[PDB]
Each structure stands twice: as C-alpha cells, then as structure tokens.
Amino acid sequence: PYKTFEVVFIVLVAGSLSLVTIIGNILVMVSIKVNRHLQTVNNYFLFSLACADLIIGVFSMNLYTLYTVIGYWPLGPVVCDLWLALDYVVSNARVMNLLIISFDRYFCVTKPLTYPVKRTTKMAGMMIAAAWVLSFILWAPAILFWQFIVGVRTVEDGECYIQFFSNAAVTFGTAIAAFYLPVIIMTVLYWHISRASKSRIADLEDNWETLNDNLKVIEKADNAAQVKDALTKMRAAALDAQKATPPKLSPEMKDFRHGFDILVGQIDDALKLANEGKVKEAQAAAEQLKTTRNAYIQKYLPPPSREKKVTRTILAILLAFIITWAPYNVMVLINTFCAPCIPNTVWTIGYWLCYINSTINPACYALCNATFKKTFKHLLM
Numbered sequence: 001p002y003k004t005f006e007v008v009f010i011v012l013v014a015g016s017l018s019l020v021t022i023i024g025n026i027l028v029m030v031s032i033k034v035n036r037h038l039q040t041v042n043n044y045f046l047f048s049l050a051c052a053d054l055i056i057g058v059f060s061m062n063l064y065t066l067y068t069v070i071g072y073w074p075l076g077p078v079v080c081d082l083w084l085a086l087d088y089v090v091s092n093a094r095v096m097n098l099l100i101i102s103f104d105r106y107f108c109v110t111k112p113l114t115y116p117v118k119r120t121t122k123m124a125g126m127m128i129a130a131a132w133v134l135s136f137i138l139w140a141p142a143i144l145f146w147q148f149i150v151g152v153r154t155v156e157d158g159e160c161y162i163q164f165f166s167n168a169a170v171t172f173g174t175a176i177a178a179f180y181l182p183v184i185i186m187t188v189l190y191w192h193i194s195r196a197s198k199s200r201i202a203d204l205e206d207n208w209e210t211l212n213d214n215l216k217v218i219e220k221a222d223n224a225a226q227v228k229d230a231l232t233k234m235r236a237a238a239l240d241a242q243k244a245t246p247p248k249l250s251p252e253m254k255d256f257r258h259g260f261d262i263l264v265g266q267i268d269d270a271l272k273l274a275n276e277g278k279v280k281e282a283q284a285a286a287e288q289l290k291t292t293r294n295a296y297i298q299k300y301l302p303p304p305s306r307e308k309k310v311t312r313t314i315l316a317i318l319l320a321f322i323i324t325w326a327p328y329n330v331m332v333l334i335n336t337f338c339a340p341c342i343p344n345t346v347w348t349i350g351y352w353l354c355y356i357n358s359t360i361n362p363a364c365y366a367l368c369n370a371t372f373k374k375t376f377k378h379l380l381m
C-alpha cells in the first residue's frame, strides 16, 4: 500500500547518504595528499580514519541498502563473507585508530618535553599500518574460514551472518573487548587530557576568549538585547580578568590594570548606548573596545592555545563514534538473551547510525578547520 513510496524514499535517502560520505571523505583524502600544510601526524591518523569511512560509504552502505530493499542476500556466500570480513576489519581498525589518536593526544599533553620530538610521520604510518594489519589478521581468517573449520556452512541460502557469533559468550566478550573497554579507555584518556590542560592562566585566561567570542557575537548581532547580553557578559569577563595577575611578574603593571579600568568603562558607555537601542553605534564602540584590548594583548599576553582547539576536535571525533555506535552495541547485548526485544526496524536504525558516523566524521574534523576549508575551496573552485 504505502510501502512503494517507502522504498523510493529508502533508495533516495540511502543513495544521498552514500554519496555525501564519498564526497566528504574523498575531499579529506585529496586535501591531505595535496596540501603540504595538511601533512602532519594528526592528519595521518585522520587520513586513515577517512579511508575507513570511504570504504564504508562505498561498500557497506550500498550493500546494506541492497539487502533491505531486496529482502535477502542476492549475491552469494563468497561475497557475503567478503562483506562480513570487510565490515568487521574496518570497524576494528576504526576502534584501534581512535585509540591511537586518544593515546597520542594524551602523551602530547602529559609528556610535553619528551614525546613531541618522537612524533614522526614514519611512526604514524607505521602504527596505522600495524592497526590495519592487526584488524585484518584478527577478523578476516575466522570469518572467511570458520565454515571449513567446523566442516559445515550453517548460513542459509539468501542470508548473510557470522556462524561463530551464535554463541552468546563470544558476542558478550567481543562486545566488552572490542567496544566497551576501548570506550572507557578513551573516556579516561580524554578526561586526563582535559584535566592536565586546565591549570594556571588558561583557566583564568578563558575570560579572554569569552570577551573575544562575545565581541564576535556583537559583530553579528541583530537587536539591542543581543548586544546587551553579550556586553554584560563582556563586563563580567573584564572584571574577573582585571584582578587576574598575568604571567609576567607596579610600574608598567598599573598599565595592565588600567587597561581593564578603561575597558569596563567603554563597556559601560556601549551598554548605556545599548539600553536605548543604538545597536550599530554600540557595535562600533565594541570595535574601539577591541582596539584597547589589542593593545593589551600585544603587551602582556602569552601565545594562544592552538592545542586546546585540537582537544575540542578530538572530543568531537570521540563523541561522534561513541554516540553513533552505542545503540547497536546495546542491541547486541540485549540480543544475547532476548531476541524478540529488538525489532528489525531498530536494528536498521543501529546499522545506519554507525554508517552515519562514517558520514559525519569529516564535519567533525575537516569542516571546522581553516586549512581544510582553504584546500576545499581551492579544490572545488
């Protein structure tokens, strides 16, 4: 009845997903291989990840669409086991790749003196190569030759699944060792990445990125309530940052406190200028505010926190994987003891959620980066 338009919707949306995934990860790979500034170790890891996501976008998405649309596996047992081995090797390589990224960042933050000089491109490529090789050797022979190990192929004609995952014990231990334990590891690692990068001026200097981002908000405002809110928040950041001693430690130091003494005054001038709705006038006043700021940046401020945004990106990738892959693993755990508890619709949701992770990774690391955006504009134009 209604399932015809449902099928058309399925092939359209699925094809769109696959195409967007292919375009995104291909753009990442070409951008890294072309731009020399994108040839750092972080982008080596992101290159391996983009490769896995491209493999998922080219094969697994279209093969799963074929399975759901046709209602059974129409290609054959050889192709079925090839696709099972491929999906498993690629997922395991994804987990190990994310672990490599997490440990790399953790060592970069916890050993700032000894570790950075050891980070070379040869070590990065050697470790990602070891990751793919380990995943392949672990999963491929079992999935491809278990039928010959037991002397029988129990997979029915038209279906596609793994025989040795019939025992709930191997599914549970595999779920613990392959997903949950690595996720806990990544959580602790990122937690120490955040705690170790937290102390001193940075915590207190966050007020400065606060008045900066609020300045940018003032630039793109539309009414007096927006510049009022951002302006008061700027006043809070300036007042907390005023009684904050900079690292360079009265003569030429009353300069530092005098700069905030004038800054809060200009924030008051623009705030009373905003209480009656002079929006653009308050914005220009905020520009002169940015001039005074500029003076005191170039006078008494340490270098910016480029590594902190890197931590933000790491969190983006890890949260992408964890959030997108949690439902499927939960469905596996529940399926170990209650099969009718998980309908086929929600199974489909889990599958497409992992694949969607492969779709959204480039937006996590590449679309928020200035260099990747420059290379993208260069490649598309």
Ligand SMILES: CCCN(CCC)C[C@@H]1CCCCN1CCNC(=O)N1c2ccccc2C(=O)Nc2cccnc21
Pocket (backbone or CB within 6 Å): 083, 084, 087, 088, 091, 092, 095, 171, 174, 175, 178, 179, 325, 328, 329, 332, 350, 351, 352, 354, 355
């Ligand atoms: C049964 C395979 C179905 N698959 C189709 C293959 C043709 C689609 C699936 C789901 C969408 C993504 C593609 N595959 C996933 C294959 N992976 C898989 O299962 N598991 C994983 C394997 C390695 C690393 C992590 C996991 C893991 O996260 N959980 C886990 C826990 C316990 C048992 N197996 C898995």
